[PDB]
Amino acid sequence: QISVRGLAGVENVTELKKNFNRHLHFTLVKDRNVATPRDYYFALAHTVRDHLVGRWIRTQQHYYEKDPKRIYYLSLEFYMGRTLQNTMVNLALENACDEATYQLGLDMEELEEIEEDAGLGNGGLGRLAACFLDSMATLGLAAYGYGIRYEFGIFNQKICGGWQMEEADDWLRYGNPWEKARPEFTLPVHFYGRVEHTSQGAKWVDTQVVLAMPYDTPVPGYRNNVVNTMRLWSAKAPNDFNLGYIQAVLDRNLAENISRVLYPNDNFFEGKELRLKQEYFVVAATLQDIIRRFKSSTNFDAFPDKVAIQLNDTHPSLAIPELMRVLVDLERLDWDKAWEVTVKTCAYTNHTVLPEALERWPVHLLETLLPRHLQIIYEINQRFLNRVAAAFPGDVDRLRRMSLVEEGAVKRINMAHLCIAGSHAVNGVARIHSEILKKTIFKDFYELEPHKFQNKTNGITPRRWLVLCNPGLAEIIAERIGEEYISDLDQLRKLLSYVDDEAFIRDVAKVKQENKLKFAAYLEREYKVHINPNSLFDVQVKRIHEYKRQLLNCLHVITLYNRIKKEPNKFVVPRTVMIGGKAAPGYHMAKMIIKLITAIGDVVNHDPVVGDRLRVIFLENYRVSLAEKVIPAADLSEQISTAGTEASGTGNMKFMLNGALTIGTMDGANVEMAEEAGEENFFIFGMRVEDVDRLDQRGYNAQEYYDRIPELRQIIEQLSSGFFSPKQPDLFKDIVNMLMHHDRFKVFADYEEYVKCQERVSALYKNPREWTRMVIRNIATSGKFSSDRTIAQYAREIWGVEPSRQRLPA
Amino acid sequence: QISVRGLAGVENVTELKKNFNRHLHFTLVKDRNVATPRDYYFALAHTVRDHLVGRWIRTQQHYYEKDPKRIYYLSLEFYMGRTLQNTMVNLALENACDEATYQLGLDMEELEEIEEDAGLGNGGLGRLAACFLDSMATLGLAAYGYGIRYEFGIFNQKICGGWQMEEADDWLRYGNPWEKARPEFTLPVHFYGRVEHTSQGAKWVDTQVVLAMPYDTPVPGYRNNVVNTMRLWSAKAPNDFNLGYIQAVLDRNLAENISRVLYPNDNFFEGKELRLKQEYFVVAATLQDIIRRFKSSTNFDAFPDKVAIQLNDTHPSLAIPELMRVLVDLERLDWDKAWEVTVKTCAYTNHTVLPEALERWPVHLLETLLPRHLQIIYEINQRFLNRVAAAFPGDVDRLRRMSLVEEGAVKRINMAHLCIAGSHAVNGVARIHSEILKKTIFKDFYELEPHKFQNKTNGITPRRWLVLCNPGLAEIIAERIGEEYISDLDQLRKLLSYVDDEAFIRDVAKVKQENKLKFAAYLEREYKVHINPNSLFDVQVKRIHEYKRQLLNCLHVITLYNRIKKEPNKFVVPRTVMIGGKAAPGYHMAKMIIKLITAIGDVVNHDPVVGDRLRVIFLENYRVSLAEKVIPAADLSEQISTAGTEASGTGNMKFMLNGALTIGTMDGANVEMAEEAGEENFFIFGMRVEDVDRLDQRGYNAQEYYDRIPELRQIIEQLSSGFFSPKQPDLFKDIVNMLMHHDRFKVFADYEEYVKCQERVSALYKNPREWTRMVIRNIATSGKFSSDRTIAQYAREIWGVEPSRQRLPA
Numbered sequence A, B: 001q002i003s004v005r006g007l008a009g010v011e012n013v014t015e016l017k018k019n020f021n022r023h024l025h026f027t028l029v030k031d032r033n034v035a036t037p038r039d040y041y042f043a044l045a046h047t048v049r050d051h052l053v054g055r056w057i058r059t060q061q062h063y064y065e066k067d068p069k070r071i072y073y074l075s076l077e078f079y080m081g082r083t084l085q086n087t088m089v090n091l092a093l094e095n096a097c098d099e100a101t102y103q104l105g106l107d108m109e110e111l112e113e114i115e116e117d118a119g120l121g122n123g124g125l126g127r128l129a130a131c132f133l134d135s136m137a138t139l140g141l142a143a144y145g146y147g148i149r150y151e152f153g154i155f156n157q158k159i160c161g162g163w164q165m166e167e168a169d170d171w172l173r174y175g176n177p178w179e180k181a182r183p184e185f186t187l188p189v190h191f192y193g194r195v196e197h198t199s200q201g202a203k204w205v206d207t208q209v210v211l212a213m214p215y216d217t218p219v220p221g222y223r224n225n226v227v228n229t230m231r232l233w234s235a236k237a238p239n240d241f242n243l244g245y246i247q248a249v250l251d252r253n254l255a256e257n258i259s260r261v262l263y264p265n266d267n268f269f270e271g272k273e274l275r276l277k278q279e280y281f282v283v284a285a286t287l288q289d290i291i292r293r294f295k296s297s298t299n300f301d302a303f304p305d306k307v308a309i310q311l312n313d314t315h316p317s318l319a320i321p322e323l324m325r326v327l328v329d330l331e332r333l334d335w336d337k338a339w340e341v342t343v344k345t346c347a348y349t350n351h352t353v354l355p356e357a358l359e360r361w362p363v364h365l366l367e368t369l370l371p372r373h374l375q376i377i378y379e380i381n382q383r384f385l386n387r388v389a390a391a392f393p394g395d396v397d398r399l400r401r402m403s404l405v406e407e408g409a410v411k412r413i414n415m416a417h418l419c420i421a422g423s424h425a426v427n428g429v430a431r432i433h434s435e436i437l438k439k440t441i442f443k444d445f446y447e448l449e450p451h452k453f454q455n456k457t458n459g460i461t462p463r464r465w466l467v468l469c470n471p472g473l474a475e476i477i478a479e480r481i482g483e484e485y486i487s488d489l490d491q492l493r494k495l496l497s498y499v500d501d502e503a504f505i506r507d508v509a510k511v512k513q514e515n516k517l518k519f520a521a522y523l524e525r526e527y528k529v530h531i532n533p534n535s536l537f538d539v540q541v542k543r544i545h546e547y548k549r550q551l552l553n554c555l556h557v558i559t560l561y562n563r564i565k566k567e568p569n570k571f572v573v574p575r576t577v578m579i580g581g582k583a584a585p586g587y588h589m590a591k592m593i594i595k596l597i598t599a600i601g602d603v604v605n606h607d608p609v610v611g612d613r614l615r616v617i618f619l620e621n622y623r624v625s626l627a628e629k630v631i632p633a634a635d636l637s638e639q640i641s642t643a644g645t646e647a648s649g650t651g652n653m654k655f656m657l658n659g660a661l662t663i664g665t666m667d668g669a670n671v672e673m674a675e676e677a678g679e680e681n682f683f684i685f686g687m688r689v690e691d692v693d694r695l696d697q698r699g700y701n702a703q704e705y706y707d708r709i710p711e712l713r714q715i716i717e718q719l720s721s722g723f724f725s726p727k728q729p730d731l732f733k734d735i736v737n738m739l740m741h742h743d744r745f746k747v748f749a750d751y752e753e754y755v756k757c758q759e760r761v762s763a764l765y766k767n768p769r770e771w772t773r774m775v776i777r778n779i780a781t782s783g784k785f786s787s788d789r790t791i792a793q794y795a796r797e798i799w800g801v802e803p804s805r806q807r808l809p810a
């Protein structure tokens, strides 16, 4: 149908059809009379998978022969989403499969909806890893993603009576056609035990053993015939485990619980033992696999020339002392040489400055679980602090500030400090974030080793986040400037010469309207809710957190409602306000915010005087597959975190690429986005980081704002009195109390500027032509935020490898 | 190479080779450079599996269109063994695959050894179910095997210091290519809860739900293109199970433990709750599936015309009250009508008379776990005892004897009594066993309903137990009489006209010698033990139990050793005595018997004076795949259970079919075997059932035998003093004490006759020609013991269906 979706040749369509029928018969053991729609999905998936394997085998063969430097990306999260469409896009198979399935009497889009999301991440950090894998394959790097194959991913969110309910994400229930179990590469991982010192070094003995079994998933590059590997470990008990008899067999579950479930916290540290076991499990298995592959190329001098290990946050920080353990205890290298290799091999990416998100493990936990690693950590600390002492003699407070060991009630290890000490590069994820790191939390470290600190602004893959989810927009762009931009997003700048082109303006606007109509229909079909497709689609989708300030959005929504009630017969630009996202199960305040949103909807959506001028919808079960639907449909993107709290954001970039305008604070990547597009083409409001600092020094008093803003006072009084909860008048007392007395994120301080800025948004929306022209100026300058750019910078500036756009033979 | 293994046509071999290469590439994602031998096995398995699916789909389609009466065989055990070779044999693919793999540079037998046994059974009962499935498919019956997909089958047995060690049988580790998950047919099973009585009957409420997910395995008939289904249920937690968050997800294991492990007891009742849950789980899921299939053909009058349910022992006895529950509570049939349907549908096979093996469940367990079923059981009992009271007025002791409810310390339900009451047919498994049932334990029931009681003598499949495991013998037989006997074993009688044929005599003897040489080499290659291939192979392989009297064998072995030590330079027929089998983990005495066997070996095998004249080997990890190796190699089959204890035996039939002579008591099927071959061609010794009864009435005193048999006295003195355990002199005190004071199985009483009979065996072995002639007379009369005969009798006399040897189209 559309050009960017590839060729549907006679030979190709015929071959796809026969292979579809072969899989239905031989693989699924079905015929057309008994086949379910799910059987049809699987037949398609296996057919597409067949096209991957040839390239997969030849890619890994190519790496064996050429022996390039290998990049190992270690993460506890890979938020992959669905694989079928992505695979078709990257292999240029989409139109051919669409035609083939149509001729078989099937609708491909319907089959695509059957695939479960691979939900092995929480949000931004997990999705970044997924975008990064796509870009590394597209840029021809010999890269491997290593993680855990969780049996249960992020929970499915149900809303019951306005409250979030969690249910297990049993994503493997029907099987996963994309993964290949590799039980032959099973590796042992050790826990507990004790340390013995001999004549020939230390020995870690009396350990409990858990097996790590790898499952490999292919990662196709964009039309370059490269297929890299994501290797995910699964926990298995050894066969003599606990070996009355029946109980011993049932107790195997204990060991296998390591890979059972993803911790559902985003930007929050929960110091539970099972989480620590997960972190060591991934690191121990991965490092053995790395070293095995290195030896099959004795002399570890060349190790950093052939291996790069990227630590995604501090979660795999144990890679540093584990590498030291292997090099010193097992390979018998001297400490100083081992340390040189480790530092040159490892690099660390920081993703947050929130104190509650920083990993600080109790010494007593590491003592029992990983006694040898604790010893190595102490030795690293001693040697590091000796360097600090020599550099800044007599500065005793610096020594205590920089220590890997934090003293106090319980002694803890600061994992971020470990990562900096043992890595040759430390990077933040947006320019403002990387500056904050050097100025505040890692200032001491920056002073000691300034060369270590870098910036790598985040990006998103234009394959999933434009071509896949928004083919209509990708097509009208390709009509003007060709197809090269899909792997070279800077080419979108060429669209600036079309900002006054009336044909293009109409097309951009048409694509958005189509996206909005399709999404409006989806809301009725799957959730029975009626919305006006001509209204402004005002959307905030992201994890529910206090710092992300969904509450500030709520205040604006109520302001709009109160203004309509005050002057009903006055014209207002109609809005559909959509908010979605999951709350961590134990995060009470975030759960209360969800309830508030639904409660506001309950009042607003049923007020006759409001009509179809204002609607508030909570988007249930926000996840990658839902993002692919709602983002192309959005008009306004809400990126309203308190300045200095959102390290980067990536949702922001997705909205920019898909034709939404942004209302946002000067936080994270918003700063660089506004810089690229021009501040006049962005809706910037609120405190800058410097203004937040000034308020903190003076002392933040929310009462001041309540006293001086009558509209804000009305809302707080409505919340307190039970306007949005008539049967439970005091339901939102915790929210009001927090807002009034202990708001770390200064919601009130940005309220006036936010509401004023929102008025400017509504004004522009009244003029469709000038709204669309500003949209074009955004899309056209979004090129910097391709993860291809991000990965190219990592490759050149951290890993020491050159990216390549050259094809491998088909 | 050999005729019975089928044709290796040019077209077939070429096609197999290309499909092998396709699976290696596309299915396994490997090439010839990285492929492991296990990859080669899987490529072969997938290639052979492809040939099954066409026939599988068309068989199940045929059943849908023709709507025949369906046979449901319910068992907690299916001891299937390996599937690859069996599939090739039944599809006539063995020579073609052998040729194809040879041309690819691979040895097929080596690949066959890679397959794990499907060890989902304990011994005789589990293996009978497997033989039965083969025969039902071969006889063209619309039959379904229903059971549990245990994650862990029978434990692997390791011998350490002469002691049995158990390790988990992780048989699914590498995947199972034969099964097909059918998550679309997932069914809920209910546990616990309580009963509510309404206006419209009883209701079972507040239950805990476990999901039952089916996995289907194909069962090919012998060259008739029929492929039936074995459906095995796997336990799954529902997604809202327990739905802090992490613990709730980890607790899903509790529900899923139902299908985790096979209880490793054979012929022994362990009244554990998890076992009861397994028994209900299989029954509840199966019956819903049965009824679903029946409704898709309202009126349950025709139910018994379209459905037969065979209960394999009492393990699935809950099918009776579960069918009543469904019919009465859910379908709203009146009691009397529901009961008529149930009785006409169900039939029960008894497999034991041992009191310790009979299932007697505590009322308090059923009360908590299955409250509605207990109520139904009481009502069944009340109505049944009313019939007994009317038939035998005033006989109050009969009422208490026949009750389904046993009074005492703890009230129990006798599951065997339930089965008789609720089945239209009750059968034993050998003529003597079925007579014992009518005369002793079920005498009261036989008097009330004589028509109910039948015999169905057990059998074994001649596919696995001759063609597959002994191709050399199958071939020399086919040369003389053709190939028809493989599905018509009575044709072996034609071999009687060859008993004086010198060519045939030499061939039979040659095949045995070849089998013995191959097995002697196996013992060195995989277990580093040296044996003399010219010695008599004296083998007892079966589960270790007191009733099977491995101890009587031990006494004979020591007698032979003591006789050699007394007269070293006297000639004795050389023997290799092989004993193998697993002991239940909690069965202390059986574990002590294994230790005794190894201890005897330790002394005997290292005595220089003995030389290669006597060897004692314990066959480690006895299982189906090992049976296929050792049985064709045997000269003498030990079937020496105390008369009246072995219900049938099936190992006995396997040895008879494969050219071993039998030393045995007149117990189980031994009686019918001796009858078929002629008593002169069998080595029969010891007490008959009547002699055991006379001894019990008088009182068994073992001291009498000790006092009057000096050779027996010497052995007991050797055991007591520590001759076979010099470092632990009292190691075997428990064994001596049991033998002397509390031997339920009268080992001493048969010792003299056993030793005397063994002398006659040695005498015959000295004359190879007359030994072989007797062998021919055994093989020739083994036809009755084909499971095709057994199943034909079940079909005609119990199920009311006609078997068919007619092909379905290829």
Ligand SMILES: OC[C@H]1O[C@@H](c2cc(O)c(Cl)cc2O)[C@H](O)[C@@H](O)[C@@H]1O
Residues within 6 Å of the ligand: A122, A123, A124, A125, A126, A128, A266, A267, A268, A313, A351, A352, A357, A429, A458, A646, A647, A648, A649, A650, A668
């Ligand atoms: O860098 C990817 C994303 O990581 C997010 C992020 C950082 C973390 O440290 C953890 Cl544990 C989870 C997470 O989603 C940041 O909040 C977001 O600003 C950033 O865009």
Ligand SMILES: OC[C@H]1O[C@@H](c2cc(O)c(Cl)cc2O)[C@H](O)[C@@H](O)[C@@H]1O
Residues within 6 Å of the ligand: B122, B123, B124, B125, B126, B128, B266, B267, B268, B313, B351, B352, B357, B429, B458, B646, B647, B648, B649, B650, B668
């Ligand atoms: O009928 C099959 C076999 O079942 C055996 C047998 C009977 C049982 O009741 C149980 Cl629980 C397990 C078992 O293996 C009998 O001991 C044997 O004599 C018979 O040949």
